[PDB]
Amino acid sequence: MSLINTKIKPFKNQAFKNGEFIEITEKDTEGRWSVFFFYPADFTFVCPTELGDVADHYEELQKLGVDVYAVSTDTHFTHKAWHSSSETIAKIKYAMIGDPTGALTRNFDNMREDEGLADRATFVVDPQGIIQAIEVTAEGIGRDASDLLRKIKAAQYVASHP
Amino acid sequence: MSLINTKIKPFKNQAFKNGEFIEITEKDTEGRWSVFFFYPADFTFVCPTELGDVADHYEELQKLGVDVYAVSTDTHFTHKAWHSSSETIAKIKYAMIGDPTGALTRNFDNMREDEGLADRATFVVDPQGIIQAIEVTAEGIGRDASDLLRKIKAAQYVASHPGE
Amino acid sequence: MSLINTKIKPFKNQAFKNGEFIEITEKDTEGRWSVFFFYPADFTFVCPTELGDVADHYEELQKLGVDVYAVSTDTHFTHKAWHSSSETIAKIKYAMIGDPTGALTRNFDNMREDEGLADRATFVVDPQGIIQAIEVTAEGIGRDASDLLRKIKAAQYVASHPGEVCPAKW
Amino acid sequence: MSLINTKIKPFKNQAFKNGEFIEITEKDTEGRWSVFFFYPADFTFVCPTELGDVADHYEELQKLGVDVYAVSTDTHFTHKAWHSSSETIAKIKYAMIGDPTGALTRNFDNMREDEGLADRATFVVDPQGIIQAIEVTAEGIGRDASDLLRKIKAAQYVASHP
Amino acid sequence: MSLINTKIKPFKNQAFKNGEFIEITEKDTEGRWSVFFFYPADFTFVCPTELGDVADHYEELQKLGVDVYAVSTDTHFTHKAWHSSSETIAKIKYAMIGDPTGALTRNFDNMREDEGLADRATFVVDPQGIIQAIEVTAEGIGRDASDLLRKIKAAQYVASHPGEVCPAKWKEGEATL
Amino acid sequence: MSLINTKIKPFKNQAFKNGEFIEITEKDTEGRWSVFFFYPADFTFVCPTELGDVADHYEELQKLGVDVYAVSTDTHFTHKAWHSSSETIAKIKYAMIGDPTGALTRNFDNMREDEGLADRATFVVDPQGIIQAIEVTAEGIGRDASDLLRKIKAAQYVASHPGEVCPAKWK
Amino acid sequence: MSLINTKIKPFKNQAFKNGEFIEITEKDTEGRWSVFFFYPADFTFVCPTELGDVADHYEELQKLGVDVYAVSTDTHFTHKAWHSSSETIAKIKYAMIGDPTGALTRNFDNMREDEGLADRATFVVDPQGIIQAIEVTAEGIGRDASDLLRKIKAAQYVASHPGEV
Amino acid sequence: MSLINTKIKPFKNQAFKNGEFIEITEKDTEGRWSVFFFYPADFTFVCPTELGDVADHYEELQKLGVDVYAVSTDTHFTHKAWHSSSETIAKIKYAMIGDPTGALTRNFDNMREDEGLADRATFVVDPQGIIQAIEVTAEGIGRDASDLLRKIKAAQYVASHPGEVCPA
Amino acid sequence: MSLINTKIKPFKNQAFKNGEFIEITEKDTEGRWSVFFFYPADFTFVCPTELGDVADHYEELQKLGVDVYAVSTDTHFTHKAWHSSSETIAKIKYAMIGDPTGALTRNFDNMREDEGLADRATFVVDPQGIIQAIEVTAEGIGRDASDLLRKIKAAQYVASHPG
Amino acid sequence: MSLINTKIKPFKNQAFKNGEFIEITEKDTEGRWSVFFFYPADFTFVCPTELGDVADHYEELQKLGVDVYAVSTDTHFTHKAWHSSSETIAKIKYAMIGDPTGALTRNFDNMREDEGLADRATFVVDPQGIIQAIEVTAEGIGRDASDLLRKIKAAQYVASHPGEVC
């Protein structure tokens, strides 16, 4: 029932990454640190800072051995369109996963069942697929990227010093 | 069992229509001839001929009192963006309903359960909410708007001329 | 759930085809494009234009490797009589399948349960038995054979090609 | 669970009788003697001698207060066409009921499930809707209308002589 | 679920035939024509004309290769007694099957459930066990053996000479004259 | 599960009694002692000694207020025929119930399901419908009528003198 | 459904028989005529004439090759006490089976469910374990031992002579 | 699911008490303290010390308002016979309930299913029918009547009290 | 399925707050901002800073109108003992709820089913009972109190003016 | 239904014993006499007389080859704290098992479901893991340690002398 300290479930989703489409599965995450950054919808007026802030810290995340996977219930097709429309989103070098089925979102118990959109949840996952940190916020409340990085560092220190 | 000659089910969806966001329910379809034009996805590399062909026949559809509802599992936000970025979709003066939940799509039994996208379906609906014509096609196979237009005229004629 | 992109189910019906009584099954549709043209009843006062239009395009459909199967819940005996009586139905050189059991009609979820008659539904089926197009209409709303033929041409092109990627003409 | 000495179940079928379409129900049978003459199909290659043989005795049946209801799984539309087609079927003054649903045929346990056609069965039914005689035969074994008339007269004698 | 054109179901009953008792099963009906002649009860005040009619045609039936099995829910013991008591039944040289379980009567869907007696029914069966003719009547409505015998000869003709049924082709456009 | 000390269930059967057909129901057994004497079949080769033995003791049973009901799955029609044919069965002045439905036989859980014949069982029933004595035997094993009479006298004694225990004394 | 002409079911009960305790199973009944004499309870105020009557006929039952099994829901301990406490029960040389579980009683469909006691039922069982005679009575209605013996002789004669009446 | 702190279930059994036969129900336990003293069987070779030990404290138990109910799967008839045969059981002036149907034994989850006999269990019950103390022992492990009597006094002391808090 | 933006479920737990035992229910949280600070166990060799960190920021939380509810599967009796034992836990002015049934913990989907202890989860709740923020970490990975304060301020800002 | 004369279930619990944490399973009980002394909670105001009474008899329980396991739905961490906070509990040299899951408690059908605390039950278990004696009491009704010892001696005697005349 509690998702913390449990293994991520298998998936197969299409994504957009650096001007091309790819297929991403649980096989790709294993052996590496992973960040599943869920959010409600592309092309929303509200707050694209969240994705842009993570894009500003991406070279630090690559040095720390972390992959970022932005996820929403929109298709990989619209991620490509949104990546060309907005200069905040255009900075994103990491994968933007499309989840129209809601299967990846439902593996993390993160669906707004009334809206058909994912809640603003972030899941730090280790090389064995175990979820080490969770952070969820309501609509309008932002997640600051510096706090994410602190939990990544904190999880990595605990990984090598039990 | 078939959806032909059954009543449409209740729904509540957000939609984009002529530069403005609106909520559309089954109450809005009551008393109106309604075309529910389902399609898989916005921003695909497939040509937007199906939707553009309906847009070319929209003045003719307006003379028959027909409301067109383009439906996909994309958000109404994504519909606005597509309407701005595409030359063919910019012509659309009819409602583009967003269906992220899939509730509207599942009311017409029209989901691709593997993909989370609607199949290419067209449902002609009369003022009492009764489905008079159904047209479904596999991916790639387009549907003709003048054929849809012919089907609406026939449905209106049958309603107006009981028995022959 | 939709019948689109599903495999057709097995059947064994008797049919009238251009003088002979024959038996048709799902085996006969394998390796061939197929059209299952459901209609309500023989000897009604509704115009048979639908079945006559398909007969006019039957040369072209045969060259496209397409078999046509007109279906109703009447018997193959009744089809023969209607083929002799009606001047429009006399044109058809394709199979008129009889489905008094309603088994073939119920495979395509096309029964008017109250009437015991099939709804007005055309199904385009490919060589692997997969339904590529569906068209259903209420009483009095005809279907166009030119539209049907355009879809078959489209379905054959799409089967022979990958997903479409638009040029600069649209 | 034999049908003999059981009441006929309700029905509502379209029928053809002397150049017009009418609706027949169980309400139309009550008060009068009835013959439910089931047969396989219209427009068959097999002779309509059985149906014409009842037509030859129909004036005699009407003297005895006996209605004839010829039943089949074809529509009432095909009955009209077959009535104008065949000289033998043109003699039919009685109702030709259409049973495309098979409901009337199934009430008499008379459906060939493999073929969707009624078997060659004749039922004699009294004014209270009670089945007094049953006759079913295979394809090519004839039903003698003279034997049918004997059984009705026998049944009518028994009704008046407890 | 019509019984016509269906195979007869297996049975095992005790019967009386020509002053002795025998067991009869479905295997005894193989390769021969069979008449199953159901009736309500022995020792009733109703006319025994129906069993006598078949006994009068039994010499003719045996020449057509047709066995007769009279059946009721009475015992084979009771059948013997009635064969000694009544001169009409005393004529019967065919088997009188007892069916106190009702299993044979229920195989032919012929039981009066409220009475525990078989209805007045005649079933014609071919060498392959397939029911070719069914006749059922109420109390007092007779069955004449001449009509039965006609149907047997018709069933035998159709078996030996299939496709020689009356053609509707002496009528409508195409004719044979 | 046992039928002892349970009430007899409702029934309606046609019967033969002294050259006359009559209907017998549970209402006819009310307020009187009743013996239900089940047996397999009329016209059997087995000796009908059991029915003849009850016939001999029938006067005694009538003086004790006891009605006897012979039961089998044969019809009342065959009971009449068996009554005139057999010398032993001609002595029967009591009711011979027919049970071709098997309903009365199954109320006493006494049907040989594979034969469609009742087992050879005797049930003693009091004025209130309560079964006071059961006796069931296999084929060949005979039931004694003088033992049946002793059981009825004991049942009638216990009904009249309940709360009776064993005595003891001397001197 | 009738229990006549059905095979007895397996059981395992402790029993009292002539000064000592023994275990009785269905295997001990194989190949022999058996009488299962069920009764309600030990130490009741009703006369034990039933059991005593069977004890009086025991020499004749041994001649016929019959095992008598007196059965109640009391324990074999209670059977021992009753055997030394009553003159009529002290005559009993046959096995007194205890059935506190009620499994033996329920195998013969003979339990008074609201009392937890067996009904007054006698079952005659042949060498193949098949029940050939049943007899049940209410309280106060005695079972005759001469009648029981007559039925055993009839059962043995029919077993040995198939067909003849 | 422990039986502790649960209300006793309805029952209707016959019993031997001091020469008389009587009927005992759950109605008879209302408004009084009760001891249900289960045991396996009458007339066994096992010493009946447990029942005689409780009989010696019965005078003290009655002054405390405590009824004793010895229970086994044997009949009330068998209790009467056992009462006369043994000198130890002759001391018992409390009710000896028979439970041949086994319902009262099964109400306290105390049946040896494959033997058809009750286990060696003691259940102390208060005036509201709530079970305050349970004791179960295997074969040949005796129960102390003095220990039972201590628990009753404690249960009566605590009955008229809230949560205990130690003085030190 | 997601707990975020859902109402808190009813509860009734015994708590220890400033030297007295009090019963806390959902009705006590109604009309006020609430923080449900879950943790594994009392008397652990693990860092007790997490509880003391919140106690150091408690004056600032009281100005913002925030009630803190520390929750574990230990008894309220145990919380009292731990409040007397450790000088770090002695600083705690706020209510320490005991949850031996696991009912309150299972309302927030926060039970380690194999351990019978609550995970290190923090739930910010508004006056209407709606969960506005969630934070869960594994064993060893701490939660800083300054981030909790920012999420409360951000949640309050969004409540005052949504736009 | 009855838990008497049944084998104990497998378990895995953390425990405190003489300033040291250890794991205890059913493997540790195999081949030994075991007393499972359940109780509701640590740091309650109720007197700890029960546990202190068993502590006074632990030396002779150890001579008899008997292990004592105090069990509660508290943690092994709280047991350490409670051992250093109370003079009565400080006497305990036997294992104090923590059962926060309630699994061990539920194996003995001893959970107060509405409270989440074990009932006041004592289970004597032989070297084959078979439950020979059960004692459950309501709150306030104390369990006597000398009676427990008297039962253990009887249980050991019956094991060493199977079957008896008297």
Residue numbers in the entry:
A (entry chain D), D (entry chain I): 1 to 162
B (entry chain E): 1 to 164
C (entry chain J): 1 to 170
E (entry chain H): 1 to 177
F (entry chain G): 1 to 171
G (entry chain F): 1 to 165
H (entry chain A): 1 to 168
I (entry chain C): 1 to 163
Task: Pull verbatim passages from the article behind this deposition.
The Prx subfamily enzyme Prx1, also typically called 2-Cys Prx, is among the most highly expressed, soluble proteins in the cell, and is characterized by two conserved cysteine residues. The chimeric EcAhpC1-186-YFSKHN described here demonstrates, that transformation of the human C-terminal YFSKHN-helix into the related bacterial AhpC confers sensitivity to over-oxidation on the chimeric enzyme. Structural details of the oxidized and reduced chimeric EcAhpC1-186-YFSKHN provide novel insights into sub-steps during the catalysis of peroxide reduction, enabling the transition from a fully folded to a locally unfolded conformation.
The asymmetric unit contains one decamer composed of five catalytic dimers (α2)5 with each subunit containing one catalytic active peroxidatic and one resolving cysteine. The intermolecular disulphide bond observed between CP47 and CR166′ in the dimer interface confirms the oxidized state of the EcAhpC1-186-YFSKHN structure. Similarly, the C-termini of chains A, G and J are also stabilized by the packing interactions with the symmetry related molecules. The average main chain B-factors analysis revealed three dynamic regions of oxidized EcAhpC1-186-YFSKHN: (i) the CP47 containing α2-helix, (ii) helix α5 that contains residues S86 and T88, and (iii) the C-terminal tail region.
